[PDB]
Amino acid sequence: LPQALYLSNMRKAVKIRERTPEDIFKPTNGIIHHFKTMHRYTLEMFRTCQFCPQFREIIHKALIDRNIQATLESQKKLNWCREVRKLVALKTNGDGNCLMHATSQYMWSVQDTDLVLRKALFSTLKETDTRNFKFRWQLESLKSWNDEWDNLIKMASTDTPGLQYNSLEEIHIFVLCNILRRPIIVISDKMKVGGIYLPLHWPAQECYRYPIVLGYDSHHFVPLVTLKDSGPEIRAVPLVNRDRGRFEDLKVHFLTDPENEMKEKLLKEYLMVIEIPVQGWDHGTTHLINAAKLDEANLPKEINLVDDYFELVQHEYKKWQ
Template sequence: MIDDEANGNVLINPPENDRFTPSPTKGNQLPAPLTPTRISGSSTESFTTPDPKKRNTQDLESKKLNRGISRATDNVNLVSQARSVILAEACDQEYFLETPVHTFALPDINAYPENFRAFLVKDLIAVSTQQSLEQANRLNWWTAYCHRLWPLSTSGDGNCLLHAASLGMWGFHDRLLTLRKTLHGYLTDSPRRESLWRRWKRYQDLLNAQAGLVYSEVEWRQEWNAIVNMASSEPRLRRLSVQSEPGSDGTTAGNIYESLEEVHVLALAHVLKRPIIVIADTVLKDMNGDDLAPIPFGGIYLPLECSPSECHRSPLLLAYDGGHFSALVAMDFPSSGPNGALAYAVPLTDSSGELLPIQFSVDPGNGNESDSSLTMTQNYDLLESYLDVVKIDPNGTRAPTPDEGKNNGLLGSIGKSVGQKLRLKLTRSNSQRQKVILCATLHMDKRHEYHDAMINNYLETARQRFQLQDEKSQNNISVV
């Protein structure tokens, strides 16, 4: 994982990840399986009996949060400085963070020996999330065209959405709750909050219709007030930590926050003025593999209330699995290294070629509860307004190597010889008639100023921990 649990503390009872919470105004009218249900990220309550094997894996990942890049000795001050700068910038802005576009990337761990590489994977990657989404064919089905992406181990304390966003941009968790406080302020006081309310109301109304539910105006406002209050930085539960000691500075260790929902992802896209793409499965299955309920989080969240000219065009990528958000990042690859995948892009379609849903895309306007939806052309126009979109001809035998796509954070141009050899066509997307894979480019050249130093410090510390672990293992073998 990338950041530590505060002060190296680990929760005695890590939060369970799967949660279904009926709306307070729905009473006991719980719909049948596959009827829309509120699903919140990273909570402490479980609706179904979790898989013990998966639970054990998740618990282990939670306990790993006392290790990682920011826990490297030389990184403590760097991370503290970076957080202070971000906090100061947040204080200067009322409802959003005016930050440069930053994208975090892992080092190329494939360059290391197998045993050390396995150590790094366990230390950094949310393995259960990766396996779950890959088996569902939602993640990395595109490796013939684009580079593989990796979900980072992310703290599961109810604030995982903001932790994941912070990790994906800067490489450390939202420990000071800077993102969460700004998000809550946006939903509470921003002049655009009414627009978000209308988008959310239309979205929720469509879900309610499937369940045969009708809200009164009072119930609508109660629901929205609950949505806003969820984003508060006040913890809803406090727990002791394994390593807590009297007088220790356990600032956020043990605090559990309200888990967040789809509309909070939309609000976060506005706070950051940056598109967010969430990779998630579409249906939650029970222990027998049968469909239980839809998962609504996956899709594209655009800062639609902001002018595209004001927004960053490189999307922030998140993974969602088991009620938990994780940062989704790429790895750096050497320019000379062989690789058959396109450098730094993410598909905007699923594996069947269907466009990912653009969440909350319609604002019905004041007093107009129209059920109108955007046409396919309007969806494409929206995507091209906020993202650098390219189309990939799936008939190409392979895609360019990483160094062929790093120019200015775009995919770059392909020379004639390369094009003839690879038979891959990349152009700006201006037509939906061609059977192509639409992708959004990632601006990987935009890094936080401490990025490289943090990575180098972490790798040095990781080597030391790996050597100690290896020595202990060898000693145990010798004793036996």
């Protein structure tokens, strides 16, 4: 069983990566270039239950970053809430482009090996209007000096730095979510790239309202995808975590002062927020907390890798019974 969803059908993978550049629109009147359609796709991982455990495991060893899954779960950041669906970390290349590999995988089930997303980011930074991105970043930086913005720009390039590409940071995630017109939520031990990145350069009416969910640990991003057909739990990611006996909101990055004053209203415009009951620290109490709905799997026939990988799996499982 191949070690990556893409590998079940390398031909189709190339076809997927080939569609991506053509789906990018470049308005050329100041507005940021963005995806026309492909940002609306979501991958889900197939179950490995309803299989033997010896076999359930084999699949899990090939596709899943178990090191990062265990770390994030042991710190109570990933899959802490018993009411919601389990998320699973998919293996991602650690070459310095993992932000883009994880994001590309979450939507399209391929990594960014043609550097389409990485180049799109660099393009926007080196070309488009970045006045407001810079203001937001100064404002966030001062909440704790200026060749810094210029080097943040150079970091997004494809230049060799010691990994093969420069590592990316919070502002790059924020720019990326505006290129995708889709929120990105990062689950990490510091939840400082952990937290919620909203496409605030766009009206929420022009954005996809289900997030991309990534995990982050040790300078490495992975996608955290939903596992298919494991109801009855809620298909959402909580927008808070337990922290020292209370619920603490995930950080929302790069807000202006007026945005911050209406943080909850913004989350509710850019995500599908639902208020769900979870168990209290007092076993006699329940609390309502906010969560954002996750998308159902929708990668079409032609560009759905995971159904190809799953078909391989079913074939070898029959042989392995």
